[PDB]
């Protein structure tokens, strides 16, 4: 320069901050399964703050529906998917609850999702009642249905 001498050589830097906040797909996943380690502050609260948006929201409930219908061997992903679908439906946003009513068959498909391998133990109940709960709160009483 003039009086000082640059010391930090440095080479090149990456891009900049993405103006399109789109990191929900990662939160939802790490939220329905924390096998590994990482930050432990409030991942669920993050996926909800994303529902408010318009993109991240669809990427959130979407990944939540897939892990919600896992196979009949490890419902662990399903139970975790119910916590993210129930948390977002509340603080997440008003759009996360509307989708739950439009996809009630998906949240109810878990109440019947029962499997214990050819011969194992019946431990897939925690998830059975879980899915039933998400639908109970989102709809406690009904005003006479009407399906032909």
UniProtKB/Swiss-Prot annotation:
Q: What does this protein do?
A: Binds to membranes enriched in phosphatidylinositol 4,5-bisphosphate (PtdIns(4,5)P2). Modifies membrane curvature and facilitates the formation of clathrin-coated invaginations. Regulates receptor-mediated endocytosis.
Taxonomy of origin reads: Eukaryota, Metazoa, Chordata, Craniata, Vertebrata
Q: Which residues form the ENTH domain?
A: 16-148
Name listed for the protein in its UniProt record: Epsin-1
Q: How does it assemble?
A: Monomer. Binds clathrin, ZBTB16/ZNF145 and ITSN1. Binds ubiquitinated proteins. Binds AP2A1 and AP2A2. Interacts with RALBP1 in a complex also containing NUMB and TFAP2A during interphase and mitosis. Interacts with AP2B1. Interacts with UBQLN2. Interacts with REPS2; the interaction is direct. Interacts with EPS15; the interaction is direct. Interacts with ENTREP1.
PTM comment = Phosphorylated on serine and/or threonine residues in mitotic cells. Phosphorylation reduces interaction with REPS2, AP-2 and the membrane fraction. Depolarization of synaptosomes results in dephosphorylation.
Query: Where does it reside?
Result: Cytoplasm; Cell membrane; Nucleus; Membrane, Clathrin-coated pit
| Family in the record | Belongs to the epsin family.
Q: Which organism is it from?
A: Homo sapiens
**Where along this sequence does the record place binding of a 1,2-diacyl-sn-glycero-3-phospho-(1D-myo-inositol-4,5-bisphosphate)?**
12, 15, 29, 34, 67, 77
Q: Which residues of the full protein are shown?
A: 1 to 144 of 576
The written remark on domains in the entry is: The NPF repeat domain is involved in EPS15 binding.
């Amino acid at each position: 320069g003039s009086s000082r001498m640059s010391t930090s050589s440095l080479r090149r830097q990456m891009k900049n901050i993405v103006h399109n906040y789109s990191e929900a797909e990662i939160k939802v996943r790490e939220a329905t399964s924390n096998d590994p380690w990482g930050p432990s502050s409030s991942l669920m609260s993050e996926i909800a703050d994303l529902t408010y948006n318009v993109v991240a929201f669809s990427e959130i409930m979407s990944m939540i529906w897939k892990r919600l219908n896992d196979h009949g061997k490890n419902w662990r992903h399903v139970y975790k998917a119910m916590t993210l679908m129930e948390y977002l439906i509340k603080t997440g946003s008003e759009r996360v609850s509307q989708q739950c009513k439009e996809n009630m068959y998906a949240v109810q498909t878990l109440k019947d999702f029962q499997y214990v391998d050819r011969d194992g133990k019946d431990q897939g109940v925690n998830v059975r009642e879980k899915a039933k709960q998400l639908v109970a709160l989102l709809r406690d009483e009904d005003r006479l249905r009407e399906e032909r």
